[PDB]
Design an enzyme around this catalytic site. Structure first.
Site, short mmCIF file in Angstrom:
data_model
loop_
_atom_site.label_atom_id
_atom_site.label_comp_id
_atom_site.label_asym_id
_atom_site.label_seq_id
_atom_site.Cartn_x
_atom_site.Cartn_y
_atom_site.Cartn_z
N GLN B 11 24.94 7.73 3.24
CA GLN B 11 26.38 7.50 3.14
C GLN B 11 27.01 7.37 4.52
O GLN B 11 27.85 6.49 4.74
CB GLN B 11 27.03 8.64 2.35
CG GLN B 11 28.53 8.50 2.17
CD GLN B 11 29.05 9.25 0.97
OE1 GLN B 11 28.29 9.93 0.27
NE2 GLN B 11 30.35 9.14 0.72
N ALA B 12 26.62 8.23 5.46
CA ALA B 12 27.18 8.15 6.80
C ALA B 12 26.82 6.83 7.47
O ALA B 12 27.70 6.12 7.97
CB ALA B 12 26.69 9.33 7.64
N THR B 172 29.68 20.62 6.86
CA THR B 172 30.04 19.92 5.64
C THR B 172 29.02 20.11 4.52
O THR B 172 29.22 19.58 3.42
CB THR B 172 30.21 18.42 5.93
OG1 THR B 172 29.00 17.91 6.51
CG2 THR B 172 31.37 18.20 6.89
N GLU B 176 22.44 22.04 5.91
CA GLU B 176 22.29 21.21 7.10
C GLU B 176 21.14 21.65 7.99
O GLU B 176 20.34 20.79 8.39
CB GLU B 176 23.61 21.21 7.90
CG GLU B 176 24.83 20.76 7.12
CD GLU B 176 24.78 19.30 6.72
OE1 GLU B 176 23.86 18.92 5.95
OE2 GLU B 176 25.65 18.52 7.17
N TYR B 217 37.43 10.05 8.31
CA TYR B 217 36.17 9.35 8.52
C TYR B 217 36.41 7.87 8.78
O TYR B 217 35.77 7.27 9.66
CB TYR B 217 35.26 9.53 7.30
CG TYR B 217 34.55 10.87 7.22
CD1 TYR B 217 34.19 11.57 8.36
CD2 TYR B 217 34.24 11.43 5.99
CE1 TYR B 217 33.55 12.79 8.28
CE2 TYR B 217 33.59 12.65 5.90
CZ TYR B 217 33.25 13.32 7.05
OH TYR B 217 32.60 14.53 6.97
N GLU B 247 15.47 -1.88 27.78
CA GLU B 247 15.69 -1.18 29.05
C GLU B 247 16.19 0.24 28.85
O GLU B 247 15.94 1.10 29.70
CB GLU B 247 16.69 -1.96 29.90
CG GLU B 247 16.28 -3.40 30.17
CD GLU B 247 17.20 -4.10 31.15
OE1 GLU B 247 17.95 -3.40 31.87
OE2 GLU B 247 17.17 -5.35 31.21
N1 LIG Z 1 30.86 9.42 11.71
C1 LIG Z 1 30.77 9.44 10.36
N2 LIG Z 1 30.09 10.47 9.80
C2 LIG Z 1 29.94 10.56 8.46
C3 LIG Z 1 30.52 9.51 7.61
N3 LIG Z 1 30.21 9.85 6.35
C4 LIG Z 1 29.51 11.01 6.39
N4 LIG Z 1 29.38 11.44 7.65
C5 LIG Z 1 28.63 12.63 8.10
O1 LIG Z 1 27.33 12.57 7.53
C6 LIG Z 1 26.92 13.88 7.12
C7 LIG Z 1 26.79 13.90 5.61
O2 LIG Z 1 25.76 12.98 5.27
P1 LIG Z 1 25.98 11.74 4.27
O3 LIG Z 1 25.69 10.46 5.01
O4 LIG Z 1 27.28 11.82 3.50
O5 LIG Z 1 24.85 12.04 3.19
P2 LIG Z 1 23.81 10.94 2.68
O6 LIG Z 1 23.14 10.30 3.87
O7 LIG Z 1 24.47 9.95 1.76
O8 LIG Z 1 22.74 11.89 1.96
P3 LIG Z 1 22.83 12.33 0.42
O9 LIG Z 1 24.18 11.97 -0.14
O10 LIG Z 1 22.53 13.79 0.50
O11 LIG Z 1 21.76 11.52 -0.25
C8 LIG Z 1 28.03 14.83 7.57
O12 LIG Z 1 27.71 15.34 8.87
C9 LIG Z 1 29.23 13.93 7.60
O13 LIG Z 1 30.23 14.42 8.48
C10 LIG Z 1 31.24 8.40 8.30
O14 LIG Z 1 31.75 7.47 7.65
N5 LIG Z 1 31.31 8.43 9.64
#
Ligand SMILES: Nc1nc2c(ncn2[C@@H]2O[C@H](COP(=O)(O)OP(=O)(O)OP(=O)(O)O)[C@@H](O)[C@H]2O)c(=O)[nH]1
Ligand SMILES: Nc1nc2c(ncn2[C@@H]2O[C@H](COP(=O)(O)OP(=O)(O)OP(=O)(O)O)[C@@H](O)[C@H]2O)c(=O)[nH]1
Ligand SMILES: Nc1nc2c(ncn2[C@@H]2O[C@H](COP(=O)(O)OP(=O)(O)O)[C@@H](O)[C@H]2O)c(=O)[nH]1
Ligand SMILES: Nc1nc2c(ncn2[C@@H]2O[C@H](COP(=O)(O)OP(=O)(O)O)[C@@H](O)[C@H]2O)c(=O)[nH]1
Ligand SMILES: [Mg+2]
Lengths: 430, 432, 432, 430
Positions: B11-12, B172, B176, B217, B247
């Site tokens: 998701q991130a 969050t 973690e 976000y 590099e």
């Molecule tokens: N910078 C940034 N961080 C994000 C965003 N969305 C989630 N995060 C961070 O990513 C972490 C949460 O992981 P996610 O990416 O939501 O989870 P996922 O990769 O989808 O994994 P699962 O849902 O458990 O399958 C936390 O530290 C959030 O603060 C974003 O749009 N931007």
């Protein structure tokens, strides 16, 4: 995608169920006739999360209604909202349990459970990816306690991998609406710890305390208490139905909120809660919202969190919001009440944010907690159970329907262990 | 210069990428409809077509259909090739085991096929940019999978990543530390260097410098978009002293395991606040050498810098960059390790930044991004290791993993591997 | 180039042909009314007349009046010569014996007369294209008859066919193995090479690539129309490196019995999905060398290719075809047998495909059809032989045959003949 | 082309016949006066499949009505739909059988059978290509059981090659509407196994179970049960009357559905079946349709398929449909219930698709099954027969009309073998 099939058993379950589907139909903007009439495309993108589709736009929710007698179901079918449900999904007996666990689990529920499974499977095969099962029942009753535990085991055997969460009404601390609540309550827990992934314990007395204390509405009928419960449970499934910045999932909450397998009993919470009229003298910003989630006054479980210690906590926010505050406040909350949280877990708060708030609101947070203070409830039930069982107070109504008192001892012994396990984590590290 | 492939996992990573690719569209003037308005640069990140619609050269994978569905239905739907958007049926549920052993492998092969079908259609290829997090299932477990698979099928090619590291105090998710350490272990041997970032530090910056009280976000992921565009600026735009993708690792990676340079960007100034600032080269260059300017909340003065790249952007004076850097080398508070007297790597590209419509940050005529590798990051690992020991000492969450095809001993191996990394930093922190 | 005769036997062949002949009408712009609108190509597949109405050079035979009646009353009624549409009185009822011994012979002679009256009126003649199935009476028993009769009356002329092979798991009749093996035995000695196709594989492709959830026979038979038009493209349209009809067998048939090259076509892309694709020569050429692109559901990597024809269509670059094929020859997963280093046969015709009005497939500017002969098809025969042994071991359906003038020993002879074919593939699968 | 001549014997046969011709006249759009008034040209292209033509558009169906007494035929001629039939085709005696097989087969049916053959031949010579014969009768009765078996043999001798299928009502498991059903039932089977190519066994109790269970219509008269039977039999002959993607044929089904000569007894099934009013809360897509064909609840034979194993199965779909699903679902069905199918047949499902659905519907599937579980029925009849024959319960009514008890022993012995033959295929391969 991640379809939910809803199970409701007992008079309390059906009545909570009936209200529970009114809100979701309201959130998605579904007409009582089954015709979608919403205004946001996001309501149809996930309308399959709860509702099947029959040609013509008639959306048939996949809820399974079971009660050992036609009493409560007939009211639902006659109610204004009753036309939406599929006629087949209703399953009705001809002799309701007399509040006794044995009859609704062994002699009467058995003759009816097979009929229910025949319909639950049809719902399961109709979903491309069935996430899990949701059950709404009550421990005090016989139909909800007996057939719910009978049915929760059967669906467990067929689909072990899927989630299976429950919302149950738990006996109140000082008032009891049924004489034999401790027997049904203790028997039902024994069969649940071994089969359910999470349980959102609620009790009427705690929910009564909300009606007049934070709200100002004397004479709150059950039709209103169920609405609070309706709203909380709809919050847990929001991320499955609408987009968000940090989406949650029924399995996400289970992983975070359940350190050990047996210790999965939670106690919910909801906000904002304010009486009409006085609502305009209060702000709706995140800060005041968060404080309302970490005070006993807004806990729907009679047990006061202060007496115990928090293990895991999940806050599921909704609506357009500042993610900074949604995480800054949790950090301040944890440092303010560090004594309220156990040391052996470095961090305890789980945050999730959704984009669509509840209908008629622009902010909402369904609190969930896993605190050791719940052991007091089960300890209280243990106190009541040993008193009654010490004289075989009502055992003859139970042994007369194909049961042995050996089971009562097994359930009492298991309950005591559950209380002990919670107690072991009262102590700090080393 | 030639192509790069961007993989956005979790998701991130998926949500971060959509902001990043908005910049690429703006810089090259590509319409969100995909059709370039009626040059040699976009070939690196975009694939040509018979029509005027360029296809971005990236792949999006997320086991939860919800996140990609927003992109697949958002106004940028037509930009992306439909088959590049890979979606599963159920979420990983923050569990490392699910995203790596049970459900991650059920869809990993499909992702490899499209990358293989994509890497094959580039006359040249530099490497991979992988966007993910440390605190999720898909962004942590699925990442470890692709690092392994891509390493085998396309080994000896650069593998870079931007990872949202767990912040020190703001958290969050509850698991973690469990999920953060696991991915670190499997990715150390199959990665080049990771660009760590923390939302806590970014939030601290946003409320401090940018001066907006309520970030989100959708706001922060854009700043992370700037560091990526600045980092990949050499591969696209002409300028004196370019810095190709391959590099970065040579300058920023003294040792194979020690490849965690935290990102730092400057100047972050709002449109209104900028009118009272001059933005001289030392000013922007000095901003990168203080605790108050980091994307990771590690106090640099606690540790010692051992490698630093200053990828300058826009109209810049190489004379001043040479002079500005020299002064920073002669300050007592700043302390480079004894064994690396040669601790700078300058890069200039003649393309001042571009502002996202409605963006909070100002229209700076000149920009710089620092990628310093510092021993102070060991504190972040050290603190994270403390959290893991507390939980696993009580065996308080293992059960969710053992049920998803992950053996008990994996947790012990990871920490012991992390412990060696802690000692590895300590040995490099001294002089023989 | 000169004429070819198309014979459509059985419900499948008759129904498939009507879609095929719709293409021929479109490509040459022939009206469904039969009258060409107010050149040298259509003479191959169409017969001239004093009026402007061209008569298709094909014959349709089906013992069940229903299927031909639809054509004989459909909007294409005037296109076909009325006497070419041969219809019996009663169906073959999926029984091989009926369509070959009792009722098949009652009408076979009439079919021969029209073919003889048709073959006599062509200054030149290449061969026959016979469309049929493996899982029906008329399409299996009547086919075996015509192979015998046409072999005698017009021996030493090419005899090609496109046969709907029984799919691995999806089945549309109970007696497919009985009827499938029987026709194979009688057709091996009186056929040149068969172009196998499976509805399972085509369905798998249609829902996968074409991206339409609900395909039907009216849909799939059209794709089978494309392979035929591409295969017969050389005989009609000019282009560099043509490939006459008699050329297919020489390249694709190392041994007389081993003449079962499965068909593979590319690129199958919908009109909307195509805007994000480039369609380079290696891309379309690579599509033909994976399990995910076959008209027969046989995993090619299980076996080894021993002959491959790439009949390119439309505006093509012979330089790239030469280069694209070379790369495929140097991949470990792809494995040609040791004894055939010369394993490609290229053919180009300057006529890009034409789209059926309302057709699902896109308007590709370039197309290719592969006709690889692979030892993996032995698995299809091996699996089919397993089914026959199970049933005939219990003698569970023989009674329907013995009552239609078919002796008991025929079943035993067929399987023993098929068993030798299994060993024949195995011997060719190794090196001496 | 492939003309069908319909034979109806007995009160049940005529009543089912009478309803059976109403639907086909409805499908083809034929006026009760015999004048075609349909709207689709496909109805006239094959109107000769059932209906002869007399000048003026008067279409005379070629049905042969025989009953030993004028009772039931007079009602048909007086009925609203009775004017369509040819006056000559009616054949009536003056003394009906008293439910006893002997009188309707030997002493009374013999005097009338020759008259029937005189008309059946005229129908046979009037058809360019007579496909086969269709018989609708009942085993329990005397006229249907006796004269039907007497006539099925006579037409068998003259036209051995043609198909000769039958729809018969079979004695119910626990209720009997005639005291001497086992005698008539056993005698009629002995004479049928040797002369008929296929038999679609049906029973009222199983069909009663449909009326109130899946439909909700209490008080279903025989006039409604016959409609279900009418619809099923019209489905078998659809491909002969309308175009389709994968056409079936009376001989096609016989080849696929009959592994061994004697084991030709099938049991039918139909869908979609849903009560009026509740119909709108259900979808009509292929998936839910297919599941309705492979559950005992929608089987018109009292024997439950679960107890036994499937040998061959044919699904005859109708209407515009996705051929992929029409074959994807069969593959999933077979893997889901692999235990329900025998291993010695590699594949068991036969699919056919037609273009024209039933009148008033856009989807239909007439299921046909050949399962070993039917042996339970014949075994049950064997249980009843041996009990009665062990004391010569009613033999004097039979031997008094030119019969010997030796025949009863022959029929019982043959019936036992039929049961044994089914049993031998219960076992798996090797
Ligand atoms: N910078 C940034 N961080 C994000 C965003 N969305 C989630 N995060 C961070 O990513 C972490 C949460 O992981 P996610 O990416 O939501 O989870 P996922 O990769 O989808 O994994 P699962 O849902 O458990 O399958 C936390 O530290 C959030 O603060 C974003 O749009 N931007
Ligand atoms: N590709 C394709 N396959 C078809 C079509 N029609 C039938 N089939 C396939 O052909 C086989 C069934 O054989 P049919 O051609 O219907 O039978 P037939 O040749 O008419 O033989 P009988 O009816 O038994 O006399 C099955 O494998 C079907 O899937 C069609 O239009 N296109
Ligand atoms: N929240 C809520 N609780 C209810 C409602 N009706 C009954 N209950 C509770 O359910 C318990 C009685 O169980 P009940 O469901 O009537 O028995 P059953 O029919 O045998 O399951 C008591 O603790 C009640 O307080 C309701 O409408 N809402
Ligand atoms: N489905 C159906 N069955 C019937 C009908 N009438 C009678 N039966 C059945 O036929 C049997 C009685 O046979 P009947 O035909 O009256 O005797 P017959 O006149 O001597 O042949 C019983 O099993 C009845 O259930 C009807 O209208 N429909
Ligand atoms: Mg046919």
């Amino acid at each position: 995608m991640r379809e939910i099939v809803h199970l409701q058993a007992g008079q309390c379950g059906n009545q909570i169920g009936a209200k529970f589907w009114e809100v979701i139909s309201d959130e998605h903007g579904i007409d009582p006739t089954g015709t979608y009439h919403g205004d946001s495309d996001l309501q149809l993108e996930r309308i399959n999360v709860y509702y099947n589709e029959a040609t013509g736009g008639k959306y048939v929710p996949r809820a399974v209604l079971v009660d050992l007698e036609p009493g409560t179901m007939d009211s639902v079918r006659s109610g204004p909202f009753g036309q939406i449900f599929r006629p087949d999904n209703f399953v009705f007996g001809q002799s309701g349990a007399g509040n006794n666990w044995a009859k609704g689990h062994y002699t009467e529920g058995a003759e009816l459970v097979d009929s229910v499974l025949d319909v639950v499977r049809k719902e399961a095969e109709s979903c491309d990816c069935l996430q899990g099962f949701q059950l709404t029942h009550s421990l005090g009753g016989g139909t909800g306690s007996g057939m719910g535990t009978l049915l929760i085991s059967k669906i467990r055997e067929e689909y072990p991998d899927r989630i299976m969460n429950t919302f149950s009404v738990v006996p109140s601390p000082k008032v009891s609406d049924t004489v034999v609540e401790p027997y049904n309550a203790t028997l039902s827990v024994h069969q649940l710890v071994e089969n359910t992934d999470e349980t959102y314990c609620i009790d009427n007395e705690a929910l009564y305390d909300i009606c007049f204390r934070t709200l100002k509405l004397t004479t709150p009928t059950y039709g209103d208490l169920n609405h609070l419960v309706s709203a909380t449970m709809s919050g847990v499934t929001t991320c499955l139905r609408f987009p968000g910045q940090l989406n949650a999932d029924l399995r996400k909450l289970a992983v975070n909120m359940v350190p050990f397998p047996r210790l999965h009993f939670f106690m919910p919470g909801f906000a904002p809660l304010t009486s009409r009229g006085s609502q305009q003298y209060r702000a709706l910003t995140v800060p005041e919202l968060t404080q309302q989630m970490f005070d006993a006054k807004n806990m729907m479980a009679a047990c006061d969190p202060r007496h115990g210690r928090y293990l895991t906590v999940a806050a599921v926010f909704r609506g357009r919001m500042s993610m900074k505050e949604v995480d800054e406040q949790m950090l301040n909350v944890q440092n303010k009440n560090s004594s309220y949280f156990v040391e052996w877990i470095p961090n305890n708060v789980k945050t999730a944010v959704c984009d669509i708030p509840p209908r008629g609101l622009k902010m909402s947070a369904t609190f969930i907690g896993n605190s050791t203070a719940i052991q007091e409830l089960f300890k209280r039930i243990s106190e009541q159970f040993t008193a009654m069982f010490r004289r075989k107070a009502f055992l003859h109504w139970y042994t007369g329907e194909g049961m042995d008192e050996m089971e009562f001892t097994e359930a009492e012994s298991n309950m005591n262990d559950l209380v002990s396990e919670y107690q072991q984590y009262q102590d700090a590290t080393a | 210069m030639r192509e790069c492939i961007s993989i956005h996992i979790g998701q991130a990573g998926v949500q971060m990428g959509n902001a990043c690719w908005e910049l690429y569209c703006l810089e090259h003037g590509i319409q969100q409809d995909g059709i370039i308005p009626d040059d040699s640069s976009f070939g690196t990140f975009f694939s040509e077509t018979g029509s005027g619609k360029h296809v971005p050269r990236a792949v999006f994978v997320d086991l939860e259909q919800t996140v990609i569905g927003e992109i697949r239905t958002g106004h940028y739907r037509s930009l992306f090739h439909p088959e590049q958007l890979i979606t599963g049926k159920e979420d990983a549920a923050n569990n490392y085991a699910r995203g790596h052993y049970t459900i991650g492998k059920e869809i990993v092969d499909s992702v490899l096929d499209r990358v293989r079908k994509m890497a094959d259609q580039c006359s040249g290829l530099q490497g991979f940019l992988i966007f993910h997090s440390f605190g999720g299932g898909t962004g942590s477990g699925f990442t470890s999978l692709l690092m392994e698979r891509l390493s085998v099928d396309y080994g000896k090619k650069s593998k870079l990543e931007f990872s949202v590291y767990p912040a020190p105090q703001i958290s969050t998710a509850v698991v973690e530390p469990y999920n953060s350490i696991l991915t670190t272990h499997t990715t150390l041997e199959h990665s080049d260097c990771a660009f760590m970032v923390d939302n806590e530090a970014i939030y601290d910056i946003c409320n401090r410098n940018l001066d907006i009280e309520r970030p989100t976000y959708t706001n922060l992921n854009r700043l992370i978009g700037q560091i990526v565009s600045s980092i990949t600026a050499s591969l696209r735009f002409d300028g004196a002293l370019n810095v190709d993708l391959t590099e970065f690792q040579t300058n920023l990676v003294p040792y194979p395991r020690i490849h965690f340079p935290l990102v730092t960007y400057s100047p972050i100034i709002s449109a209104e606040k900028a009118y009272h600032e001059q933005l001289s080269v030392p000013e922007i260059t000095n901003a990168c050498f203080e605790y108050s300017n980091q994307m990771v909340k590690c106090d640099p003065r606690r540790g010692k810098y051992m490698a630093c790249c200053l990828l300058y952007r826009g109209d810049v004076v190489p004379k001043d960059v040479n002079a500005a850097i020299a002064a920073i080398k002669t300050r007592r508070s700043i302390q480079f390790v004894d064994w690396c007297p040669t601790g700078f790597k300058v890069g200039i590209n003649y393309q001042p930044p571009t502002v996202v419509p409605g963006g909070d940050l100002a229209k700076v005529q000149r920009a710089v991004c620092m990628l310093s590798n510092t021993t102070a990051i060991a504190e972040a690992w050290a603190r994270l290791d403390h959290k893991f020991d507390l939980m696993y000492s009580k065996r308080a969450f293992v059960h969710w993993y053992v049920g998803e095809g992950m053996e008990e001993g994996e947790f012990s191996e990871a920490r012991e591997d992390m412990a060696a990394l802690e000692k590895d930093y300590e040995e490099v922190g001294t002089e023989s």
